Design an enzyme around this catalytic site. Structure first.
Site, PDB file in Angstrom:
ATOM      1  N   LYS B 112       0.222  -4.240  19.010  1.00 43.96           N
ATOM      2  CA  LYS B 112      -0.489  -3.044  18.569  1.00 43.96           C
ATOM      3  C   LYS B 112       0.275  -1.781  18.946  1.00 43.96           C
ATOM      4  CE  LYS B 112      -4.161  -4.145  20.785  1.00 43.96           C
ATOM      5  NZ  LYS B 112      -3.742  -5.536  21.109  1.00 43.96           N
ATOM      6  N   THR B 113       0.778  -1.722  20.176  1.00 45.54           N
ATOM      7  CA  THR B 113       1.421  -0.503  20.648  1.00 45.54           C
ATOM      8  C   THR B 113       2.667  -0.190  19.837  1.00 45.54           C
ATOM      9  OG1 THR B 113       0.546  -0.779  22.884  1.00 45.54           O
ATOM     10  CG2 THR B 113       2.548   0.543  22.631  1.00 45.54           C
ATOM     11  N   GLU B 156      -4.661   1.999  18.005  1.00 48.02           N
ATOM     12  CA  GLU B 156      -4.858   0.646  18.478  1.00 48.02           C
ATOM     13  C   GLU B 156      -6.326   0.263  18.403  1.00 48.02           C
ATOM     14  OE1 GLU B 156      -3.520   0.229  22.421  1.00 48.02           O
ATOM     15  OE2 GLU B 156      -1.398   0.520  21.959  1.00 48.02           O
TER      16      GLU B 156
END
Ligand SMILES: [Cl-]
Ligand SMILES: [Cl-]
Lengths: 305, 305
Positions: B112-113, B156
């Site tokens: 996600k990051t 996120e």
């Protein structure tokens, strides 16, 4: 721009959804076995109408909406599934309409239909011509306009409906919480209660939850609701209360107490404390929306039943 | 108009949320134990700042936002609870911001990051200055503006976060579905998978689900998603694919195949197929948004790691 294709667009629950989508500016197509006045009205309003079902009818559609009255063998559905076009049930599209409007969701196990009608009646008395949903059917009383033209969409929110938790209202009522639909939640009442908490948390932080504290289950979950709330009922601790309930004929009179307002005398053509409570719910929502006392009084007394 | 009051407004996860709310036009107040540059910036932008905690600071607030670093003994929280003011956790307000913007939610257990950063990098290369959320922190790279000024909010979406299912994105990515957070769902992977299906159904029917079909669990649930979807991966049946993966130094090159587009050569300064996949996810979203190939190429190669 998207094209929505309705399979069975003449069905009673489908035609209204197509009209709202037309009003919102979408391309709308639909198929049905028989032409009718419903399909001619939709065509007059911009819908492309096909008679009979065939895979070609679904071409170019970005989404299909299908009733609960269509086989998967239906060639239009089958063509969409092969091409990966999304197929959504009628009820999900119906719930989706609330995202485009100022949505008022009337939840609770009992009294949704009456409370929704009273809300519509009062808003109309205030000149607002709301679109409202009862029994899966879109309606706008006496409107000279396409469904969905109003800024307001008032809808029953049924906890047995698969789309219950995908509603995105601005205002939500909970009339009461009964165990009728425990089967929807694995036969567990505590799970059913938790769903009502999650439903109210679909409200925005600026939203409003309108809670009947005469119902012991609604009162139980009240501390869980991290949204603005107004409570109503005969309970002496309710924010909005009915007192001096009396009859004059088949008409019920009572006095409504509201924070920072003078007492207001209202009447409704319906018996029972449950219809006093439904009127209170209406009065809270109308008051929050800025509707005058005169329209509130007119809307409540004019509703028949 | 509403007033939001932040308890501990100088905290790292709180200051950004207050700034976005200021940008949206709300009255914002906040309390903190120490003045800092963060609180002076918020005051310069219109926030009313109190030093120290006392019940008076919460007066007039329509909502409180509280960190995970405040006792309930805190007098401001206690005053709000007594007066029935809603108290919401930092993380719910953060998720709520997506309702005001064109929200891109980057979900999946891993990646996600990086994927969020690549998306921000590409959008910025296209001149769009997005606000993006990593680790609960709002950021806008090199912006000369208040957080939230952009039309775009890229965040996120963590499946262990209590607000996972209250996100309202326009676009949603699912990089992969792993069992790391089964405990959030009663230690049951099948329940965790069902949550990802429900999350994607928070999309509007005009939304877009961006699905990594190299992950077997994502591929499993794909037929369940009744929303527009684009799939990506090295799989030969993915809509958007990477081929001819190669290295030149610590830089990974590959060719991206897209429906109805010529092949596009891209590079990224990151090793591994998982970062090729994260780049594919970015390319799908950027392509759907109409961003040019030149900004896509520039955004991917410029990101460091
Ligand atoms: Cl609360
Ligand atoms: Cl589908």
């Amino acid at each position: 721009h998207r094209r929505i294709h309705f399979v069975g667009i003449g069905g009673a629950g489908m035609c209204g959804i197509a009209e709202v989508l037309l009003n919102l500016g979408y391309e709308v197509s639909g198929s049905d076995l028989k032409a009718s006045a419903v399909t001619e009205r939709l065509e007059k309003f911009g819908a492309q109408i096909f008679i009979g079902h065939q895979a070609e009818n679904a071409d170019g559609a970005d989404v299909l909406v299908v009733s609960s009255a269509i086989n998967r063998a239906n060639p239009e559905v089958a063509s969409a599934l092969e091409r990966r076009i999304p197929v959504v049930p009628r009820a999900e599209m119906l719930a989706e309409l609330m995202r485009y409007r100022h949505g008022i969701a009337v939840a609770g196990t009992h009294g949704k239909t009456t409370t929704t009608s009273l809300i519509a009646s009062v808003f109309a008395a205030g000149g607002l011509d709301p679109t409202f949903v009862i029994g899966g059917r879109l309606n706008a009383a006496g409107t000279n306009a396409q469904l969905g033209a109003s800024r307001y969409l008032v809808a029953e929110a049924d906890e047995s409906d698969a789309s219950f938790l995908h509603l995105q209202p601005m205002v939500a009522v909970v009339t009461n919480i009964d165990a009728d639909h425990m089967a929807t939640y694995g036969g567990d009442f505590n799970k059913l209660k938790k769903t009502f908490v999650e439903f109210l948390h679909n409200l925005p932080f600026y939203g409003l939850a309108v809670m009947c504290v005469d119902d012991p289950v609604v009162r139980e979950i009240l501390p869980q609701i991290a949204r603005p709330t107004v409570t109503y009922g005969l309970s002496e601790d309710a924010d909005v209360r009915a007192i001096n309930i009396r009859q004059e004929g088949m008409r019920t009179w009572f006095t409504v107490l509201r924070p920072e307002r003078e007492p207001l005398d209202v009447s409704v053509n319906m018996p029972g404390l449950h219809n006093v409570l439904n009127s209170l719910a209406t009065i809270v929502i109308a008051t929050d929306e800025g509707i005058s006392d005169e329209a509130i009084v007119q809307g409540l007394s004019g509703f028949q039943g």
